[PDB]
Amino acid sequence: PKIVILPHQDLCPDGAVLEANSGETILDAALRNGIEIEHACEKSCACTTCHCIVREGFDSLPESSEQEDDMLDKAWGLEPESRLSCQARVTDEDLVVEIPRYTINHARE
């Protein structure tokens, strides 16, 4: 399915259209296309730097785990449609995704 990344001043100025594979995470699809979404804990579901908001298609994605939910409670700019992009896997529906203006990372320099 197609994943549209909304325009992001720092990581995707004009936005982008990604052709993602079913079962593939939003993050891996983004990274293959050179969209550098931060992933501090290396896709271990232990941070919130890969946080994204699924504006369209949130219901198509597999429900978030208990471990993911706990991490999201720490996410800056949390919304009902927030997901850790390293955990959210595309299924059979096109998505519209927004990368947050900021993400909390106590280890950032």
Residue 96 found at the interface with ligand FES (CB under 6 A) = no
Q: What's the CA gap between 44 and 47, in Å, rounded?
A: 8
Q: Which two tokens stand for residue 41?
A: 């804990």
Which of 4, 11, 31, 45 lies at the binding interface for ligand FES (CB under 6 A)?
A: 45
| N- to C-terminal Cα separation, the chain | 36
Nearer to ligand FES (CB atom), residue 35 or residue 50: 50
Nearer to ligand FES (CB atom), residue 14 or residue 73: 73
Q: What's the CA gap between 73 and 69, in Å, rounded?
A: 7
Using CB under 6 A as the criterion, what x/- string covers residues 1-40 for binding ligand FES? --------------------------------------xx
